[PDB]
Amino acid sequence: GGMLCYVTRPDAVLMEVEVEAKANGEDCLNQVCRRLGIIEVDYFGLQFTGSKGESLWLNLRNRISQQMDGLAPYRLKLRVKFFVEPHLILQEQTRHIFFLHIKEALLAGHLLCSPEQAVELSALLAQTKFGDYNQNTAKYNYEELCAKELSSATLNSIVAKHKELEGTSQASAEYQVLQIVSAMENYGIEWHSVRDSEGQKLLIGVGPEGISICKDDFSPINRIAYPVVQMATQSGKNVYLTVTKESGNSIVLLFKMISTRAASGLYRAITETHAFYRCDTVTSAVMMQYSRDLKGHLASLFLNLGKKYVFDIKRTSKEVYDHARRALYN
Q: How many CB atoms lie within 10 A of CB 301?
């Protein structure tokens, strides 16, 4: 009955969003964006946590009430779904929200960086929160982004770099954070917790370039691009990716997920990310998938001749007459 949604913004602020009882996910997010002054809505999504504690994206085309059936009070987290190059974001509020999202990922160690990267980033984050250097108010955060803190030895370089930023406006400092983070290898990569057969706890990253495979954010086993991935399917708690090897050999990768919703989430993450970054239009992405289905249906039609089409006759009426002529002459 004209249901209430508790939307958490990336600056930790809770919004009370009243939507129509049978409203879609797009209706929530649109009202959230209208109230935040966001025009570039298509970069955003609403994250929620399912029955099995798994983080899922709200489907903008379906009803909220169906998608979040059991789980009430309806709690949604406003998040950037599609990361693009910071300069390509035309509105300043949208840029600030990308920064809010990126700062949170950094301060939670969800994007680990080299000591050299962590020095400039720690100084830029200081300039953003407090402004130009002041001994009274100048707290830093080097430990969260990096592996270990080098104490005074590195703090002297971070206090040195924050001093070089004297004059850098809040917006500019934020833009540089976005610029540095957008250059990173794992920028715009969405990590999903899976199972390789029964053996290992693998982590799948869906990003603009393609699917990334690694065991708990370690050395990437395969940084597979999208043209290499032939097909993908979802069955229950499983995800069946059809990826082809350099020799033409189609090696079907298997992943086991915590739930059916989580398995759907990854399948949708592959289809959606590919279409967003690799297709001209949604129509084009719909076509590409359709074409791949017909193409594949015909590839199975020619994998299995005169056995089924057996005839008892050795000759036709014409052949009989000609064989009788030839037989007598020769």
A: 8
Ramachandran area for residue 317 (φ above 0: left; ψ -120 to 50: alpha; else beta): alpha
CB atoms < 10 A from the CB of 163, how many? 13
Residue 136 is encoded by which pair of tokens?
């009274």
Q: How far, in Å, are 194, 254, 257, 271, 275 from residue 54 at the CA level?
A: 12, 20, 10, 20, 24
DSSP single-letter state for residue 1? -
In angstroms, the CA 242 to CA 260 distance is 19
Amino acid letter, 107 = L
Residue 152 and residue 246: Cα distance in Å, rounded? 50
Q: Is 137 exposed, middle or buried (0-12, 13-18, 19+ CB in 10 A)?
A: exposed
Residue 46 CA to residue 271 CA, distance in Å, equals 18
Residues 92 and 179 occupy one common structural domain: yes
Range of the structural domain that residue 77 is part of: 4-86
- Are β-strands 4-8 and 74-80 bridged in parallel, bridged antiparallel, or unpaired? parallel
Beta-carbon contacts of 196 under 8 Å, excluding residues fewer than 6 positions away, are: 202, 254, 255
> From residue 255, how far is each of 53, 177, 244 by CA, in Å?
19, 35, 16
According to the entry, how was the structure determined?
A: X-ray
Q: Count of CB atoms within 10 A of residue 293's CB?
A: 11
Whether residue 149 is found in the same domain as residue 93: yes
Q: Domain check: are 92 and 82 in the same one?
A: no
> Residue 101 and residue 12: Cα distance in Å, rounded?
11
**Encoded tokens for 243:** 């990826």
Task: Give me the helices (H) in the chain, please.
Answer: 25-36, 64-67, 92-107, 115-129, 151-164, 170-183, 260-278, 282-300, 317-329
Task: Give the β-pairing of 203-206 and 14-18.
Answer: unpaired
Contact by Cβ (8 Å): 117, 180:
yes
Beta bridge partners of 284: none
Question: To what resolution in angstroms was this structure determined?
Answer: 2.5
**Beta strands at 44-49 and 74-80: parallel, antiparallel or unpaired:** antiparallel
Answer yes or no: are the C-beta atoms of 264 and 237 closer than 8 Å. no
**Does residue 103 share a domain with residue 80?**
no
